[PDB]
Amino acid sequence: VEWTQQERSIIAGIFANLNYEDIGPKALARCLIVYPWTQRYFGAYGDLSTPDAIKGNAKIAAHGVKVLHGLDRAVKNMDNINEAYSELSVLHSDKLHVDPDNFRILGDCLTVVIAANLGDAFTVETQCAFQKFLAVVVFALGRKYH
Amino acid sequence: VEWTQQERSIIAGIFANLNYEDIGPKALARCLIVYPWTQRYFGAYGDLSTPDAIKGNAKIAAHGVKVLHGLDRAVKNMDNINEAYSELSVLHSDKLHVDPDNFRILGDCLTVVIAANLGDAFTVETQCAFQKFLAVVVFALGRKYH
Amino acid sequence: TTLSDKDKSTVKALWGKISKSADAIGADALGRMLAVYPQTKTYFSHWPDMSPGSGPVKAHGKKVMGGVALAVSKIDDLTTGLGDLSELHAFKMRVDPSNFKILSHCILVVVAKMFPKEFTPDAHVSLDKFLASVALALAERYR
Amino acid sequence: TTLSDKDKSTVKALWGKISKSADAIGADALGRMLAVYPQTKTYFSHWPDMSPGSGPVKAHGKKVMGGVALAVSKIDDLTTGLGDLSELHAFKMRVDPSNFKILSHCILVVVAKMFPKEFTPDAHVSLDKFLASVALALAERYR
Ligand code: HEM
Ligand code: HEM
Numbered sequence: 001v002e003w004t005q006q007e008r009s010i011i012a013g014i015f016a017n018l019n020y021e022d023i024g025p026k027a028l029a030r031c032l033i034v035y036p037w038t039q040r041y042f043g044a045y046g047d048l049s050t051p052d053a054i055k056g057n058a059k060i061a062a063h064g065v066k067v068l069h070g071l072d073r074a075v076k077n078m079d080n081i082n083e084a085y086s087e088l089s090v091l092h093s094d095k096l097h098v099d100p101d102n103f104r105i106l107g108d109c110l111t112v113v114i115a116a117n118l119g120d121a122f123t124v125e126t127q128c129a130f131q132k133f134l135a136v137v138v139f140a141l142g143r144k145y146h
Numbered sequence: 147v148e149w150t151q152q153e154r155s156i157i158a159g160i161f162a163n164l165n166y167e168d169i170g171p172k173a174l175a176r177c178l179i180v181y182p183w184t185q186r187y188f189g190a191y192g193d194l195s196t197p198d199a200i201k202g203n204a205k206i207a208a209h210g211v212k213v214l215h216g217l218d219r220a221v222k223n224m225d226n227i228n229e230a231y232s233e234l235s236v237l238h239s240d241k242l243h244v245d246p247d248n249f250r251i252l253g254d255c256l257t258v259v260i261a262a263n264l265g266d267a268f269t270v271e272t273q274c275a276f277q278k279f280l281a282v283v284v285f286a287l288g289r290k291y292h
Numbered sequence: 293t294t295l296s297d298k299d300k301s302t303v304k305a306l307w308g309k310i311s312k313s314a315d316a317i318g319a320d321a322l323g324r325m326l327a328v329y330p331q332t333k334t335y336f337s338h339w340p341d342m343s344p345g346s347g348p349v350k351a352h353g354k355k356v357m358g359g360v361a362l363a364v365s366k367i368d369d370l371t372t373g374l375g376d377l378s379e380l381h382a383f384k385m386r387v388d389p390s391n392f393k394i395l396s397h398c399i400l401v402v403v404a405k406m407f408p409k410e411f412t413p414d415a416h417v418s419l420d421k422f423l424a425s426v427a428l429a430l431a432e433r434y435r
Numbered sequence: 436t437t438l439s440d441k442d443k444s445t446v447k448a449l450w451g452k453i454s455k456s457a458d459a460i461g462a463d464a465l466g467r468m469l470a471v472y473p474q475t476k477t478y479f480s481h482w483p484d485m486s487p488g489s490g491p492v493k494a495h496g497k498k499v500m501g502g503v504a505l506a507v508s509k510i511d512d513l514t515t516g517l518g519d520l521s522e523l524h525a526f527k528m529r530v531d532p533s534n535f536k537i538l539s540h541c542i543l544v545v546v547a548k549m550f551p552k553e554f555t556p557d558a559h560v561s562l563d564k565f566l567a568s569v570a571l572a573l574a575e576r577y578r
């Protein structure tokens with residue numbers, strides 16, 4: 001909620017160089033494999049029978065990119081995250097019925113994927129800022145559950 | 147955090163009528179028994195070797211009352227809870243080194259003890275308001291950890 | 293974590309006292325879970341009503357506590373005993389196991405509310421350990 | 436939850452690949468836990484420095500990974516294998532068990548960062564289950 005200039009810079013820098021078509025699918029596939037209850041929501045997405053099927057699923061991949069671009073509004077409106085995610089929160093609550101604990105789990109998967117991508121560049125400061133960002137976004141997404 | 151007039155009334159009602167000398171010791175003793183790692187902070191308080199010793203320990207009892215009166219400032223300042231707890235957060239972080247996860251656990255024990263005390267008066271509405279109140283207080287107590 | 297002899301005998305003794313009101317404890321605990329922790333409602337959107345005391349909540353409270361009664365019966369081997377229940381939660385409902393701790397807490401609150409004399413800190417540690425074991429047994433088949 | 440033979444083989448294979456860097460993994464994961472989740476700093480206030488790369492962090496990082504090494508050796512019976520370390524954590528340090536999941540996460544992040552090729556979703560699920568079992572074994576003696 002109170003961002004430093006370094007934190008803002010770190011977040012902008014991550015998203016500025018992000019390959020969404022690489023990271024998005026990886027983070028979502030990993031989520032579905034490591035925490036398989038998240039597969040609940042994707043019954044219309046085709047074959048999810050094995051980890052190989054999930055990794056190869058084009059519709060899951062496309063959704064991974066969509067979800068990751070869902071973080072964009074937060075990066076552009078870092079001081080107004082709660083309001084920016086209001087509608088997305090009611091969507092997940094009232095239409096999709098997504099258990100909001102899953103937002104936290106996806107965030108952890110995304111962290112692992114970004115760490116693997118960035119290697120040494122994923123410094124302690126970077127992880128601090130990214131975790132803070134994720135915590136705010138995940139809270140914003142849970143806000144309208146009733 | 148927004149409060150309805152009803153939530154304010156419920157919370158004010160619980161505390162207005164509370165027997166602190168009964169509820170406070172019960173909540174803290176229960177915490178030390180059910181979640182024994184919390185004993186780590188009370189090494190100067192005497193015998194905590196058994197449930198009977200904890201239940202009978204006068205210093206633990208007095209501390210339970212103090213902790214429960216620690217909630218009064220939130221009741222009196224429902225719209226300014228973060229600021230009400232800033233100094234106590236610094237105390238618990240920097241002086242006492244209390245793991246703030248223990249605040250959550252004490253809240254759950256307090257919930258159990260209040261439910262046992264109120265019986266049928268511990269309605270669903272009352273539990274909703276009380277949980278919301280505890281969540282806000284526990285968050286405020288964790289704010290100054292760094 | 294493993295249940296000691298003391299834990300097992302404490303849980304069986306408490307179950308003997310409260311089992312007569314199992315259905316009520318279940319309905320009340322589920323009703324409270326849904327109202328107090330509205331994130332849990334996401335698994336029940338197919339129900340016509342989720343309010344406390346509603347038909348769906350009463351009926352499901354009954355089922356849940358029968359699962360608890362089964363766990364008490366199979367307390368010496370919860371992994372094997374709750375295997376089928378674990379499979380249903382793992383693969384049919386696909387419930388995020390983090391929610392099991394929420395229901396556990398609501399059961400404890402209701403047991404306290406209904407049986408204040410019986411629910412001593414000593415019974416509380418054992419029942420909390422037991423419900424943790426049930427949660428873990430329920431999570432067994434997920435992955 | 437129970438580790439499958441696949442889980443155990445996967446963890447043993449991964450450990451074979453990463454063990455040469457175990458000290459670094461420990462130091463980095465511990466440094467990250469302290470900085471990213473500063474609530475965990477409360478157990479280390481007697482240390483002169485808690486910053487990443489500091490002497491105490493490096494030294495303790497190696498000890499923690501030595502415990503993980505022990506766990507991999509005792510993967511078929513973690514309860515017994517980690518009994519001593521559970522007794523230490525339960526009765527000497529008295530660490531709230533909620534923290535073990537935080538360190539587990541930080542270890543996964545560091546493993547992914549240092550061994551991205553090795554850390555596949557399949558390795559990830561088995562390692563996550565393994566660290567969850569280690570955490571449970573450490574919690575055994577608490578109550
Ligand atoms: C936590 C970060 C997440 C963000 C930022 C995010 C964002 C989004 C966005 C932007 C959409 C598109 C909505 C539209 O087009 O109207 C969406 C849809 C959806 N999301 Fe989320 N989401 C997140 C997490 C999750 C998780 C963890 C799950 C389930 C495990 C999930 C399940 C879904 C589903 C099922 C849809 C609808 C897809 C469809 O149209 O069939 N989301 N999300
Ligand atoms: C609702 C949560 C809590 C509240 C409102 C609270 C409040 C307080 C207050 C008002 C004091 C006295 C401060 C002063 O003298 O200026 C205090 C001290 C203390 N608290 Fe907390 N507390 C909470 C939770 C906890 C928990 C969970 C623990 C440990 C498990 C804890 C451990 C202590 C200790 C060790 C002291 C110092 C006692 C001494 O000096 O001997 N508190 N707390």
Ligand code: HEM
Nearest residue numbers: 332335336352355356358359360380385387391392395426
């Ligand atoms: C003590 C922990 C729990 C036990 C013992 C338990 C037990 C049961 C049992 C016995 C059934 C019926 C099985 C059948 O008829 O095939 C059931 C169904 C179900 N449970 Fe669990 N449960 C537990 C926790 C939870 C939690 C925490 C949730 C979600 C937050 C949940 C969600 C469901 C759902 C959605 C169903 C299907 C209900 C329906 O569609 O009518 N359960 N449970």
Ligand code: HEM
Nearest residue numbers: 475478479498499501502503523528530534535538539570
């Ligand atoms: C979950 C995996 C963990 C493993 C395998 C592990 C292992 C170890 C080992 C081997 C020691 C040294 C024991 C000795 O001196 O013989 C130790 C000490 C210690 N551990 Fe753990 N630990 C773990 C998690 C944690 C966590 C999450 C915390 C706190 C947030 C923690 C807090 C401590 C503390 C405070 C000490 C004593 C260090 C000192 O006093 O300098 N441990 N641990």
